[PDB]
């Protein structure tokens, strides 16, 4: 988990970046995931939008599911509850280790809400050091 101040800082940047992405300003070549997402609010400037997009793509490409959830929340502006409702609606049957033995069952809505929150938190944790270093790298060289 990030500290409260680190979260406020990164969440702020991701809100600005998300609005910039949603306005269509990211070139398709810079991220196929973002481009595919966009085929289906104050904003940062273009230099910052590109820098953040390169950071996010370079971190989140490993987990397309989490990447999509990040884009739903920050770019489209969907609430965590709205993302979890759809996540729950399309969820696959899972092997659940219950008391007395395992069973096959689709996850509850409460479980899907917790998982969406955890996925967003884990994504911000991964993004934070890379974005912090990206801004510091730009400052150093320029």
Author numbering: 7 to 46, 55 to 156
According to the publication:
The crystal structure of 21Q was determined at 1.45 Å resolution. The structure of 21Q contains six helices (H1-H6) and three long loops (L1-L3). A segment of L2 is disordered in the crystal structure, indicating the intrinsic flexibility of this region. Surprisingly, the structure of 21Q is reminiscent of the binary complex structure of σR4 bound to anti-σ RseA. Specifically, the folding of 21Q H3-H6 is similar to the folding of σR4, while 21Q H1 binds to 21Q H3-H6 in the same way as RseA binds to σR4. Because H3 and H4 of σR4 form a helix-turn-helix (HTH) motif and participate in the binding and recognition of the −35 element, the corresponding helices of 21Q (H5 and H6) probably participate in the binding and recognition of the QBE. Other than that, there is no structural similarity between 21Q and λQ, which is consistent with the observation that although both Q proteins act by a similar mechanism, there is no obvious homology to their protein sequences.
